[PDB]
Amino acid sequence: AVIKVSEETLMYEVRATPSPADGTYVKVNPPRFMWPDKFPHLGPVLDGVPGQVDEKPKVVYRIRISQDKNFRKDVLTGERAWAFFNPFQCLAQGKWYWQHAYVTPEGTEEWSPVYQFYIDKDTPEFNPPTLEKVLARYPSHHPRVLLDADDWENIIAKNNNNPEARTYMDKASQCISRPLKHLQEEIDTTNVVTLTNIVQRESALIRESRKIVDREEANVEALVRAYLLTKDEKYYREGINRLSEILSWQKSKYFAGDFNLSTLLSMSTSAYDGFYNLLSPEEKQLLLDNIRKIGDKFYNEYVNHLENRIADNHVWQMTFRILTMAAFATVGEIPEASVWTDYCYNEWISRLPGLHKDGGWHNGDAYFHVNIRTLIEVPVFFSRISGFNFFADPWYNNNALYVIYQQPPFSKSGGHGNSHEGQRSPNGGRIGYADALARECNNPWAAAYVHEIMQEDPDILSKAFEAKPADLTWYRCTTPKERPAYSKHLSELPESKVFKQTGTALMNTDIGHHANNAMLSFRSSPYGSTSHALANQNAFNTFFGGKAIFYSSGHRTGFTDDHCMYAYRNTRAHNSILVNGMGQKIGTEGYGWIPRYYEGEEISYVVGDASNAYGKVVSPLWLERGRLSGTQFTPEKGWDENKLEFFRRHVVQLGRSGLFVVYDELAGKEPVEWNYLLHTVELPMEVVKEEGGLRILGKNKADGISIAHLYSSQEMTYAQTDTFFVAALDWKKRLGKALPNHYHFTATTAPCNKVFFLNIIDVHGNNRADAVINHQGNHITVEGWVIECNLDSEGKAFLHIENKQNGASLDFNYNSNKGATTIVDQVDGKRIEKRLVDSLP
Numbered sequence: 001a002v003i004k005v006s007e008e009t010l011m012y013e014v015r016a017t018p019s020p021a022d023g024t025y026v027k028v029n030p031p032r033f034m035w036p037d038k039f040p041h042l043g044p045v046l047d048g049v050p051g052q053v054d055e056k057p058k059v060v061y062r063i064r065i066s067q068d069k070n071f072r073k074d075v076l077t078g079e080r081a082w083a084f085f086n087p088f089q090c091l092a093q094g095k096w097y098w099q100h101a102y103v104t105p106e107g108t109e110e111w112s113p114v115y116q117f118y119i120d121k122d123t124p125e126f127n128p129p130t131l132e133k134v135l136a137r138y139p140s141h142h143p144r145v146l147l148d149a150d151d152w153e154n155i156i157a158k159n160n161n162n163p164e165a166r167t168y169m170d171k172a173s174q175c176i177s178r179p180l181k182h183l184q185e186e187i188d189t190t191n192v193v194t195l196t197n198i199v200q201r202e203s204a205l206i207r208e209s210r211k212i213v214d215r216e217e218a219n220v221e222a223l224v225r226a227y228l229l230t231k232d233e234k235y236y237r238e239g240i241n242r243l244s245e246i247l248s249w250q251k252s253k254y255f256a257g258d259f260n261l262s263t264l265l266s267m268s269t270s271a272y273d274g275f276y277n278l279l280s281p282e283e284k285q286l287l288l289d290n291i292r293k294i295g296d297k298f299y300n301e302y303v304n305h306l307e308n309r310i311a312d313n314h315v316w317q318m319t320f321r322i323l324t325m326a327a328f329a330t331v332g333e334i335p336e337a338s339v340w341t342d343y344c345y346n347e348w349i350s351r352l353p354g355l356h357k358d359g360g361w362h363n364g365d366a367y368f369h370v371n372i373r374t375l376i377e378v379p380v381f382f383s384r385i386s387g388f389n390f391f392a393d394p395w396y397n398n399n400a401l402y403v404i405y406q407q408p409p410f411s412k413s414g415g416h417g418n419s420h421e422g423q424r425s426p427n428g429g430r431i432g433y434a435d436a437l438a439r440e441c442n443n444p445w446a447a448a449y450v451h452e453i454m455q456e457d458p459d460i461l462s463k464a465f466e467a468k469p470a471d472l473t474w475y476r477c478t479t480p481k482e483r484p485a486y487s488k489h490l491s492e493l494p495e496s497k498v499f500k501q502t503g504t505a506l507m508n509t510d511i512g513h514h515a516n517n518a519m520l521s522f523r524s525s526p527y528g529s530t531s532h533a534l535a536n537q538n539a540f541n542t543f544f545g546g547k548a549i550f551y552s553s554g555h556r557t558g559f560t561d562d563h564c565m566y567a568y569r570n571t572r573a574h575n576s577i578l579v580n581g582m583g584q585k586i587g588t589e590g591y592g593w594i595p596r597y598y599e600g601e602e603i604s605y606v607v608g609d610a611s612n613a614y615g616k617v618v619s620p621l622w623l624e625r626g627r628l629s630g631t632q633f634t635p636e637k638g639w640d641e642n643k644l645e646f647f648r649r650h651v652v653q654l655g656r657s658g659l660f661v662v663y664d665e666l667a668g669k670e671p672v673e674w675n676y677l678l679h680t681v682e683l684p685m686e687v688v689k690e691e692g693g694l695r696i697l698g699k700n701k702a703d704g705i706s707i708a709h710l711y712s713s714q715e716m717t718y719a720q721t722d723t724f725f726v727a728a729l730d731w732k733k734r735l736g737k738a739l740p741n742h743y744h745f746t747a748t749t750a751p752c753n754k755v756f757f758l759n760i761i762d763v764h765g766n767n768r769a770d771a772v773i774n775h776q777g778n779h780i781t782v783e784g785w786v787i788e789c790n791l792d793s794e795g796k797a798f799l800h801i802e803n804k805q806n807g808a809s810l811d812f813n814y815n816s817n818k819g820a821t822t823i824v825d826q827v828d829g830k831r832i833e834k835r836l837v838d839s840l841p
């Protein structure tokens, strides 16, 4: 029942294995074929500072696919400049064989081993049309990307009475005859020049230049759309005026980072497609010169790189969509765009949207939003030009649940990924996204999220959020789809949701009534702590009424700076466990996973395994970032030789009571001191001895309470502090100072090879008084729950929880259950029994 994983990593920064995997049943027909590059390529390690980069040869691959193992009969073949292939047909049922080849510059083939896969009668079909079909019917007229010329007059008429459309003309009109100065006059470099660390200095230059570029992009895009909605050429004249000035900034020493360059490509695409029929020969050459130059630069960066990165952030967020639209804007007009369209259309189909197929966002709460326009605009565009529904990808309906559970109405987000602490309430961008999912997928839960939130806040779409990567106003101006009618209520959702592949879980007592909702989030993820993800495997957070109590601490001050590495990403910042003060490895190697779980009604359950997440940092990507950034991955900073053999954290939701039980199994290869952590981010914790353990009271500045009743198989000492491991200096801001302190509780055990912790957490607000924990009859009772467990370092772990009155129970043991967890639950008046065993992700 208990699976042990012995892998150095579960996910790879750079693809190491073929998909579909050897001997597997594919999850979709046709399969999406992908394989590692002949010359595996990590590429630049940072936006501002590339680091050591290898050559990336142009290459040719081949593929053959057949139910005939000797590849003689009915063989599908392909040749590509990149390591992915789409058959564009549904394959027959049964067993299949395939292999891919690298073709040397001399014409020699290096064939892979022959791999096998199976197609079932049950295998889902998701078969978008060939690019040849799409281009055959693609019109040569402009506009054809921002909208279609045939639909132009209708879109104008429909928006004459759309108050959302008025904002473009208002914003654009402010620009007219209002000169834009040159970059060097608009930019603020007064902070940049004070910085001596090159990663920080270059990062700040990126930030300062993007401030100006992004401000002006909003102007240029408003000018293009104002022209499309009115046909008043004053918007064309100023649009060309303003864009010409921005383009002239190209070669400035201040014009830094790839988003700025992609922004030039994007605006050039909008002005070219939108103003096409008005362009003078010089204006057209200007726009086309820049499309060619910048599109070629990004294609050359992506190819033999993007497709095999675990995820390439700036590309997935904005930059891929931007090449896609530039390619479809100019296909048939410039030769280069044939290659770009081929690449982008196939790469989307190959592996997008998303990384985790359960719908979770790998990079967490904040960065999800930076993908919103990409997640919607690309498949909307592909769908209308192809006549095929790209939203039939099951990821979208799965992602709808992530949107709701990860940040319920008017609620603090669950606490994952860089900048998680700033996500306090669903913003207009998130609402615009759920709105699109509701329309494109006819998803009643997404519809409920939008309807119930707009009921309380009618103006939410117009509130504050970063427009550049997330604003869907233009989508709303141009879609012929209406919002579906409100049907399901959020209150009809399951109390808990587990994302097994993402490695996260959300538990709620009242998700459909946010102000009364006691909530716990959990992470133990195969993605580890690379990219924007944190080193928080087996970490939980708690919330009441949509405000956090026990919560991951620290501030997002950068991407690789000392505060981030030592006090924010670092395991010491989170509600998890340290080993002799040492934390989880930075990178994909610091992974966790969720071996078993149960989403129920009277009881819910999730387990995280972080047994392999600790030790020395070995990720070549993060070792290079560390070298460049001045990071020290040393025992003094929190990383040392691994001592951890086993770490499972069992998390039990006690129905809708607001009570959660957290039970830990820990084993080390030698006696160690175990450090049990809790943090709060508004007010200090209050600690007192309680029976044979500790009571840790957390509270926020509002109604929120979370009380940990913590027991261990060993004697514990404790301490609290207000200080971060290193100051949260906001170095990115002019005269930036230290950001506000948080609060850090640590219980430390006597040295031992094995330890168990029981933590009964009481999460509530003004809805009820604290729960009373009774220590009677050599077990523990609370509100009709009886809780028994092993708190004996020399005994076998077990956890037995039962509410006789509600008919719920959970039994984890290594004796009669043989490592399994058995559940009894009541769902709609029916007794439900489950036996849970481990499964890999």
Ligand SMILES: O=C(O)C1=C[C@H](O)[C@@H](OS(=O)(=O)O)[C@H](O[C@H]2[C@H](O)[C@@H](NS(=O)(=O)O)[C@@H](O)O[C@@H]2COS(=O)(=O)O)O1
Binding pocket: 045, 046, 047, 048, 049, 199, 202, 203, 206, 311, 312, 313, 314, 317, 370, 531, 532, 557, 558, 559, 560
């Ligand atoms: O949009 C982002 O993903 C992002 C915005 C910023 O460029 C940067 O954040 S920061 O202000 O804290 O520096 C950060 O960019 C990363 C990016 O995510 C990385 N992509 S990855 O290789 O897939 O992980 C990579 O490009 O490095 C960037 C930072 O470069 S730096 O600014 O020179 O330090 O996140």
Ligand SMILES: [Ca+2]
Binding pocket: 313, 316, 317, 363, 367, 368, 370, 371
């Ligand atoms: Ca992201």
Ligand SMILES: [Ca+2]
Binding pocket: 364, 415, 416, 417, 418, 523, 532, 533, 534, 535, 536
């Ligand atoms: Ca995270």
